[PDB]
Enzyme design. Structure first.
Site, PDB file in Angstrom:
ATOM      1  N   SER A  75       0.749  -1.280   0.000  1.00 18.47           N
ATOM      2  CA  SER A  75       0.000   0.000   0.000  1.00 18.47           C
ATOM      3  C   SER A  75       0.763   1.304   0.000  1.00 18.47           C
ATOM      4  O   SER A  75       0.155   2.380  -0.165  1.00 18.47           O
ATOM      5  CB  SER A  75      -0.924   0.057   1.190  1.00 18.47           C
ATOM      6  OG  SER A  75      -1.941  -0.900   1.021  1.00 18.47           O
TER       7      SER A  75
ATOM      8  N   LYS B 247       0.037   3.450  -2.861  1.00 20.12           N
ATOM      9  CA  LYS B 247      -1.092   4.370  -2.910  1.00 20.12           C
ATOM     10  C   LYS B 247      -0.652   5.822  -3.058  1.00 20.12           C
ATOM     11  O   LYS B 247      -1.242   6.585  -3.838  1.00 20.12           O
ATOM     12  CB  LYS B 247      -2.062   4.160  -1.725  1.00 20.12           C
ATOM     13  CG  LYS B 247      -2.926   2.885  -1.832  1.00 20.12           C
ATOM     14  CD  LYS B 247      -3.840   2.765  -0.641  1.00 20.12           C
ATOM     15  CE  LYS B 247      -4.636   1.468  -0.639  1.00 20.12           C
ATOM     16  NZ  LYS B 247      -3.903   0.308  -1.253  1.00 20.12           N
TER      17      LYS B 247
ATOM     18  N   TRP C 162       1.197  -3.262   4.052  1.00 20.30           N
ATOM     19  CA  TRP C 162       1.163  -4.652   4.543  1.00 20.30           C
ATOM     20  C   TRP C 162       0.921  -5.641   3.396  1.00 20.30           C
ATOM     21  O   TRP C 162      -0.199  -5.856   3.014  1.00 20.30           O
ATOM     22  CB  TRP C 162       0.091  -4.806   5.618  1.00 20.30           C
ATOM     23  CG  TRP C 162       0.156  -6.096   6.399  1.00 20.30           C
ATOM     24  CD1 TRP C 162       0.835  -7.263   6.051  1.00 20.30           C
ATOM     25  CD2 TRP C 162      -0.483  -6.367   7.655  1.00 20.30           C
ATOM     26  NE1 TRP C 162       0.626  -8.218   7.014  1.00 20.30           N
ATOM     27  CE2 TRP C 162      -0.169  -7.702   8.006  1.00 20.30           C
ATOM     28  CE3 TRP C 162      -1.306  -5.619   8.509  1.00 20.30           C
ATOM     29  CZ2 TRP C 162      -0.646  -8.297   9.182  1.00 20.30           C
ATOM     30  CZ3 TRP C 162      -1.785  -6.219   9.681  1.00 20.30           C
ATOM     31  CH2 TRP C 162      -1.452  -7.531  10.010  1.00 20.30           C
TER      32      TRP C 162
ATOM     33  N   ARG D 153       3.469  -1.339  13.600  1.00 25.53           N
ATOM     34  CA  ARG D 153       4.258  -0.574  12.645  1.00 25.53           C
ATOM     35  C   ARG D 153       4.382   0.870  13.136  1.00 25.53           C
ATOM     36  O   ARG D 153       5.502   1.441  13.152  1.00 25.53           O
ATOM     37  CB  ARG D 153       3.690  -0.631  11.234  1.00 25.53           C
ATOM     38  CG  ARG D 153       3.700  -2.037  10.605  1.00 25.53           C
ATOM     39  CD  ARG D 153       2.813  -2.128   9.377  1.00 25.53           C
ATOM     40  NE  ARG D 153       1.456  -1.759   9.752  1.00 25.53           N
ATOM     41  CZ  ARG D 153       0.455  -1.586   8.903  1.00 25.53           C
ATOM     42  NH1 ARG D 153       0.661  -1.736   7.597  1.00 25.53           N
ATOM     43  NH2 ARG D 153      -0.751  -1.236   9.368  1.00 25.53           N
TER      44      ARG D 153
END
Ligand code: 4J6
Length: 245
Positions: free
Chosen positions: A51, A54, A191, A231
Site C-alpha cells: 500500500s 497508494k 502490509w 508498525r
C-alpha cells in the site's frame, strides 16, 4: 545532546526485538541517512511496496485528471475483505483506510500504458509494473528498498517529485496520521500479505513545529497475529527515542 548513539541503537533494536519481528527504520536528516533496528541489512533489499504505492497512485491519478480530491468513489456493494471498506469514499479517506478497491479503480482509470510511463518517469523502485495495472504492487513485479522509500518520502515532503506542486500538496494532505506536541506525522502504512514472508511498511516524514521535515521509512516482517499497529508503535517509539518527536 547526552544519550550515546550506542544507547539509541540498542533501544531501537529492542523495539523490533520486543515485537518479535525483523525490521529496520531509516531516518533522513538533511542529506544524511541513518539506519536503525534489528536487521540493518534490510536497508538495501527489495520488497514489494504494497500500500505504500497508494501515494504514487494518488499523485499519478490526480496529475492526469483521473479523479479530484472530492470525488466520491462509490462502494459497488460487493463484499470486501474488510468491512471498513464497504462504503463510499474520497481518495483521502481511502488512503487513511488503505482501501485497495478505490486505488484499484484509480489504477484502471490511469491504465497500464500511462501507469508504466509514469512510474518510469518518477523512477520509483525497480520501476517494473508488468502487465496487470491493478495488482503490480502486491506480489510483483514492482519492488523497492527501504532506502528508496525514505528517498521518495523525502522527495514528496519537499515537493521535488515531477508533478505539479498542487498535485503534491493534495496528496500530502491525505497522509496526516498523527500530531504529537507540535510535530506532525505524515505517513502511509503498508502490509503485503500475498508475498512470503509478509512485509510491513510505514513510510513518511515528521514535520516539526519550526518547519523542518525528517523523513523515515520503517520496513519489517509481519507474522500472523501481529496487529498492524506495531508498525506505528515501533515508529513513534523510535522517533521519540531520537528526539524527533
Ligand atoms: C496494502 O498494503 C493493503 C492494505 N494495507 C493495510 C494497512 O494497514 O496498511 C491493510 S490492513 C486493513 C486496513 N487497515 C486495517 C488494520 N488497521 S491497523 N492499524 O493496521 O491494525 C485492516 C491492507 C492489507 C491492501 C493492498 O490490501
Amino acid at each position: 545532546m547526552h544519550i550515546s548513539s550506542q544507547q539509541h541503537e540498542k533501544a531501537i533494536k529492542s523495539y523490533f526485538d520486543e515485537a518479535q519481528t525483523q525490521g529496520v527504520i531509516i531516518i533522513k536528516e538533511g542529506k544524511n541517512l541513518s539506519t536503525y533496528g534489528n536487521a540493518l541489512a534490510r536497508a538495501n533489499k527489495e520488497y514489494v511496496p504494497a500500500s505504500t504505492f497508494k501515494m504514487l497512485n494518488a499523485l499519478i491519478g490526480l496529475e492526469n485528471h483521473k479523479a479530484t480530491t472530492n470525488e466520491i468513489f462509490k462502494w459497488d456493494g460487493k463484499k470486501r475483505t474488510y468491512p471498513m471498506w464497504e462504503k463510499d469514499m474520497t481518495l483521502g479517506e481511502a488512503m487513511a483506510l488503505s482501501a485497495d478497491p478505490v486505488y484499484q479503480e484509480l489504477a484502471r482509470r490511469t491504465g497500464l500504458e500511462l501507469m508504466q510511463k509514469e512510474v518510469k518517469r518518477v523512477n520509483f523502485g525497480n520501476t517494473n509494473i508488468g502487465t496487470q495495472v491493478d495488482n503490480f504492487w502486491l506480489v510483483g513485479p514492482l519492488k523497492i528498498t527501504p532506502v528508496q522509500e525514505v528517498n521518495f518520502a523525502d522527495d514528496l515532503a519537499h515537493n521535488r517529485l515531477p508533478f505539479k506542486l498542487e498535485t503534491q500538496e493534495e496528496v500530502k494532505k491525505m497522509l496526516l496520521i498523527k500530531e504529537v506536541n507540535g510535530s506532525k506525522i505524515y505517513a502511509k502504512s503498508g502490509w503485503g500479505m500475498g508475498v512470503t514472508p509478509q512485509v510491513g511498511w510505514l513510510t513518511g516524514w515528521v514535520e516539526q513545529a519550526n518547519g523542518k521535515k525528517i523523513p523515515f521509512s520503517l520496513n519489517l516482517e509481519m507474522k500472523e497475529g501481529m496487529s498492524g499497529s506495531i508498525r506505528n508503535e515501533i515508529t513513534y517509539k523510535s522517533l521519540e527515542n531520537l528526539g524527533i518527536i
